[PDB]
Amino acid sequence: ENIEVHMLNKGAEGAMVFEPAYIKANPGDTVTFIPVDKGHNVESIKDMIPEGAEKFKSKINENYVLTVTQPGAYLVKCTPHYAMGMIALIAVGDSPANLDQIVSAKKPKIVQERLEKVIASAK
Numbered sequence: 733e734n735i736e737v738h739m740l741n742k743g744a745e746g747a748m749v750f751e752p753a754y755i756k757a758n759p760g761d762t763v764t765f766i767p768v769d770k771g772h773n774v775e776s777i778k779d780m781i782p783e784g785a786e787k788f789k790s791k792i793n794e795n796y797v798l799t800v801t802q803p804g805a806y807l808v809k810c811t812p813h814y815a816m817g818m819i820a821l822i823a824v825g826d827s828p829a830n831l832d833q834i835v836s837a838k839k840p841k842i843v844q845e846r847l848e849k850v851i852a853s854a855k
């Protein structure tokens with residue numbers, strides 16, 4: 733099953749956002765990132781995707797279809813806007829085993845606030 737995510741200059745959480753910023757998925761699902769506004773892409777954050785998952789980085793302004801297979805948590809960023817908090821969390825399966833690690837990892841303050849928000853909303 734496919735989940736669509738919009739890449740935006742501005743949205744509900746402020747500037748430089750993925751909508752949704754939390755994607756709940758199962759193995760074999762696709763997540764389709766749509767460049768509604770220009771200037772955006774999607775890239776896996778290093779040491780913030782599951783064991784066995786392949787890193788990725790899409791082309792700026794490209795419609796990108798990510799297939800997620802490995803269970804666990806994936807923190808993805810918009811490469812230019814990571815420092816402005818432009819991130820999404822993908823959770824594949826229940827109780828993603830690497831979520832607490834990702835939460836504890838070094839990352840921009842604004843990214844952290846946004847990440848904690850979607851985790852709390854998902855509970």
Ligand SMILES: [Zn+2]
Nearest residue numbers: 771772810813
């Ligand atoms: Zn961006």
